Amino acid sequence: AFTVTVPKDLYVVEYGSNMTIECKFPVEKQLDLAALIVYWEMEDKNIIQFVHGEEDLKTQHSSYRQRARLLKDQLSLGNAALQITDVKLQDAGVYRCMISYGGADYKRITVKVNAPYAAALEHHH
Amino acid sequence: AFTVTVPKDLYVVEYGSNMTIECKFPVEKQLDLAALIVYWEMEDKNIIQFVHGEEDLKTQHSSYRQRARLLKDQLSLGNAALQITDVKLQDAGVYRCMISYGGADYKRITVKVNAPYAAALEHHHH
Numbered sequence: 723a724f725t726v727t728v729p730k731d732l733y734v735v736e737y738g739s740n741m742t743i744e745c746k747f748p749v750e751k752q753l754d755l756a757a758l759i760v761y762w763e764m765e766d767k768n769i770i771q772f773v774h775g776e777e778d779l780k781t782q783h784s785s786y787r788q789r790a791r792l793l794k795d796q797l798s799l800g801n802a803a804l805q806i807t808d809v810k811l812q813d814a815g816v817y818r819c820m821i822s823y824g825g826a827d828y829k830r831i832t833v834k835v836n837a838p839y840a841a842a843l844e845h846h847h
Numbered sequence: 848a849f850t851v852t853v854p855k856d857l858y859v860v861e862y863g864s865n866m867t868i869e870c871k872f873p874v875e876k877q878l879d880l881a882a883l884i885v886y887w888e889m890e891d892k893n894i895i896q897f898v899h900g901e902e903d904l905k906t907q908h909s910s911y912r913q914r915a916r917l918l919k920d921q922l923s924l925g926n927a928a929l930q931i932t933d934v935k936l937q938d939a940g941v942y943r944c945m946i947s948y949g950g951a952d953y954k955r956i957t958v959k960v961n962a963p964y965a966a967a968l969e970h971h972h973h
């Protein structure tokens with residue numbers, strides 16, 4: 723069966739750093755880009771959509787603009803890796819990577835964000 | 848674009864009855880089952896998986912045992928309908944219909960559960 727796997731289903735990262743959350747699917751041969759679909763979301767807001775070799779960002783949620791990229795470089799390795807830069811406190815939650823490449827499956831990844839008092843306090847108001 | 852559509856994205860049902868929540872996907876002429884993949888989840892609790900023309904119950908969440916069917920007949924019509932029987936108070940929430948058939952898409956459906964005092968009282972006391 724075609725199954726998406728997640729090497730680590732929980733990440734805890736420090737406010738303001740960068741994170742790469744990985745999502746693995748089988749790639750036996752050379753990648754067939756036109757058969758590939760990658761959807762990354764967080765809660766119910768789109769982070770990246772990838773169909774026919776191109777990222778589509780019309781969908782992408784405000785709070786992910788210019789901070790979220792899919793390392794297409796790893797896709798040929800079978801790795802839909804999402805890179806978030808300048809991790810905010812509002813990035814903590816459940817992410818889902820959904821992959822269709824001759825079959826389909828999806829997996830959740832939970833992200834916790836440690837933060838110093840100051841950043842938490844400004845998130846508070 | 849491959850688009851899953853939901854004719855009704857809100858359902859109101861009475862406790863202990865059955866509900867059928869509707870989810871439609873494009874099929875022009877006769878269906879290719881080896882390409883069809885349907886997942887019904889509810890707030891990240893797996894309800895149904897349908898792969899290779901077979902429902903997969905290996906991931907089915909405890910609370911949906913033998914209460915959930917996918918109407919296998921109407922799949923050729925472009926109809927992924929999830930059928931829940933003996934609707935519980937914990938069946939209220941956001942459902943998600945995920946469909947891969949060449950393209951891929953998913954849609955949410957909210958379900959509210961009306962229940963009389965006694966049933967709500969046992970649910971409250973759980």
Ligand SMILES: COc1cc(OCc2cccc(-c3ccccc3)c2C)cc(OC)c1CN[C@H](C)C(=O)O
Pocket residue numbers: 759760761771773820821822826827828848849850884885886945946947951952953
């Ligand atoms: C949230 O909506 C989505 C979701 C998309 O992947 C959703 C997606 C992507 C990959 C695999 C599985 C899947 C996983 C397990 C079981 C069944 C399917 C799923 C649901 C792609 C989209 O775009 C291609 C759009 C956008 N709508 C527009 C109308 C469109 O499809 O053009």
